[PDB]
Design a protein around this nucleic acid. Structure first.
Ligand code: ZN
Ligand code: ZN
Length: 70
RNA sequence: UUAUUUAUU
């Protein structure tokens, strides 16, 4: 998968252990975080779901603008 | 509208 180790392994960051071990598809260290190939218009238009429901099921992985302030 | 994204041995 192109998403391999593109996101932190949350169970490893929370408890320091992971049942997937060296085969875990998520990052156990920031040294393993790779670069995501994203659409050239990534976050250039307002996310309809976040600007309508106040939330978005894609979370920080959404390809559209949620809040313009960090 | 670019209308999208892996919780996985
Ligand atoms: Zn893990
Ligand atoms: Zn969104």
């Amino acid at each position: 998968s192109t998403r391999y180790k593109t996101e932190l392994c949350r169970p490893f960051e929370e408890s320091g252990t992971c049942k997937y071990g060296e085969k875990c598809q998520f990052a156990h260290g920031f040294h393993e975080l790779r670069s995501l190939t994203r659409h050239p218009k990534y976050k250039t238009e307002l996310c309809r779901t976040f600007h309508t429901i106040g939330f978005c099921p894609y979370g920080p992985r959404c390809h559209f603008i949620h809040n313009a302030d960090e």
